[PDB]
Design a protein around this ligand. Structure first.
Ligand SMILES: O=C(O)c1ccc(Cc2cccs2)cc1
Length: 284
């Protein structure tokens, strides 16, 4: 396996930091002027993570259409993803407006609400069936329907109601709960299992709007999820699987959102996940 050879060569030479910096150097730079307007300061979690103007998701309202979210459109793989920050106390209603307007079936959450003793995102979904949430600013109601708690992830069924029209939709919430506070998982087995569970739900399929994916900033863990998915889909589709270049797929994705894959360890983990996800598709 070529990617596996490139992998053993970088590991034996200990050059992960050098490969990573080369990607940082070659990555696209596009304007983010809407993100930086003074009216939007409390809509951004991090001053250094903004959506590009060309790929940003627009809210369908005349007041202020801004949300920190990007459309990643992968033309050859035929997959689209929305990558977004963890919602803030004043953007939870905007978040559910986006899910509604973009016709998403699934939300993928890769963080815990508290990590390293600090809040990484708002408690944006209801924890009990009989205590629903109403978002008065966007006119939406959200109800917990069911919850399935497993060792490495939790799946929830949610009902989202547009209070304006009384239409309802079922949203699936896929919550990966065991990413460690520091570094990356030792084995990619539980992350690949989780990826397969999202695929099996229909959430990534072209009959729905794009999947919404987030962590805290929406670039690191979130970047790893869409990079692994896209690379495995391309290996399934092409006559020569050996031709899939993970570094070139990552640079393509960085044309749509800055900073995807935050560390040399996240880059190495993405290689491991793709290599193992291929080894098992080589014989399940
Ligand atoms: O790089 C290789 O040598 C290689 C990679 C993948 C395959 C077979 C696969 C096709 C699709 C997913 S795995 C064969 C050879």
């Amino acid at each position: 396996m070529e990617m596996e050879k490139e992998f053993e060569q970088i590991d034996k030479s200990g050059s992960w930091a050098a490969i990573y910096q080369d990607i940082r150097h070659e990555a696209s730079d596009f304007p983010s002027r809407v993100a930086k307007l003074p009216k939007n300061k409390n809509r951004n979690r991090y001053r250094d993570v903004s959506p590009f103007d060309h790929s940003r998701i627009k809210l369908h309202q005349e007041d202020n259409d801004y949300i920190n979210a990007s459309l990643i459109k992968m033309e050859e793989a035929q997959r689209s993803y929305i990558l977004t920050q963890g919602p803030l106390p004043n953007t939870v209603g905007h978040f559910w407006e986006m899910v509604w307007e973009q016709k998403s079936r699934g939300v993928v959450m890769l963080n815990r609400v508290m990590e390293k003793g600090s809040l990484k995102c708002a408690q944006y979904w209801p924890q009990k069936e009989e205590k629903e949430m109403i978002f008065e600013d966007t006119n939406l109601k959200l109800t917990l329907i069911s919850e399935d708690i497993k060792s490495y992830y939790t799946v929830r069924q949610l009902e989202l109601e547009n209070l304006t029209t009384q239409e309802t939709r079922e949203i699936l919430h896929f919550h990966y709960t065991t990413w460690p506070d520091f570094g990356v998982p030792e084995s990619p087995a539980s992350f690949l299992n989780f990826l397969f569970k999202v695929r099996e739900s229909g959430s990534l399929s072209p009959e729905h709007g794009p999947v919404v994916v987030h962590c805290s900033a929406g670039i690191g863990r979130s970047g790893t999820f869409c990079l692994a998915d896209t690379c495995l889909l391309l290996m399934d589709k092409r006559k020569d699987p050996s031709s899939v270049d993970i570094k070139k797929v990552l640079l393509e994705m960085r044309k749509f959102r800055m900073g995807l894959i935050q560390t040399a360890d996240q880059l190495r983990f993405s290689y491991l996940a793709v290599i193992e996800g291929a080894k098992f598709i080589m014989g399940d």
